Design a protein around this motif. Sequence first.
Motif, PDB file in Angstrom:
ATOM      1  N   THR A  17       0.847  -1.173   0.000  1.00 38.79           N
ATOM      2  CA  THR A  17       0.000   0.000   0.000  1.00 38.79           C
ATOM      3  C   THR A  17       0.879   1.217   0.000  1.00 38.79           C
TER       4      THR A  17
ATOM      5  N   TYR B 131       0.672   5.515   0.246  1.00 42.21           N
ATOM      6  CA  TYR B 131      -0.136   6.691   0.530  1.00 42.21           C
ATOM      7  C   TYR B 131       0.486   7.928  -0.101  1.00 42.21           C
ATOM      8  N   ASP B 132      -0.321   8.798  -0.693  1.00 44.04           N
ATOM      9  CA  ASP B 132       0.126  10.073  -1.265  1.00 44.04           C
ATOM     10  C   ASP B 132       1.262   9.973  -2.304  1.00 44.04           C
ATOM     11  N   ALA B 133       1.213   9.038  -3.252  1.00 45.50           N
ATOM     12  CA  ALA B 133       2.217   8.952  -4.301  1.00 45.50           C
ATOM     13  C   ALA B 133       2.077  10.128  -5.269  1.00 45.50           C
ATOM     14  N   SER B 134       3.171  10.572  -5.872  1.00 46.17           N
ATOM     15  CA  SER B 134       3.120  11.664  -6.840  1.00 46.17           C
ATOM     16  C   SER B 134       2.569  11.176  -8.177  1.00 46.17           C
TER      17      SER B 134
ATOM     18  N   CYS C  94       0.263  13.632 -16.641  1.00 45.66           N
ATOM     19  CA  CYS C  94      -0.337  13.019 -15.469  1.00 45.66           C
ATOM     20  C   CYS C  94      -0.725  11.572 -15.789  1.00 45.66           C
TER      21      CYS C  94
END
Length: 66
Positions: free
Chosen positions: A42, A44-47, A55
């Motif tokens: 898992t 969290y907050d990946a770029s 994007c």
Amino acid sequence: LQCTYIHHDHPASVGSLVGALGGKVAVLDYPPPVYLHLSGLTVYDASALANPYLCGIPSLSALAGF
RNA sequence: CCAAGAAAAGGACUGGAAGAAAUCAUCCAAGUUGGGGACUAUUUUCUGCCGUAUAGGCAG
């Protein structure tokens, strides 16, 4: 093409193009359609912004790095 | 040796008042389900006694 916009505060302080565009710059948006075995990881907050042009799936240079 | 390394968006709320969808209207006609057949097999419950006694109690 599929795209979104990135905002810049004080456009005059970043450059000719950003100023001319009013601080809103368009980028491509192409999300995914969703031996050692590592399971269940898992993050969290990946770029999500791989390069200033695109994007989508996180930069592959980062996985090679990892 | 992962566009590298660190990061508190927090605080306060009162959308309320009134209201009339009605009038009529017809589903009908006939119709053929039909001929056959082993639940008893390798299964256990048999023999005496008390008692007016297919009552009710006991020994093998």
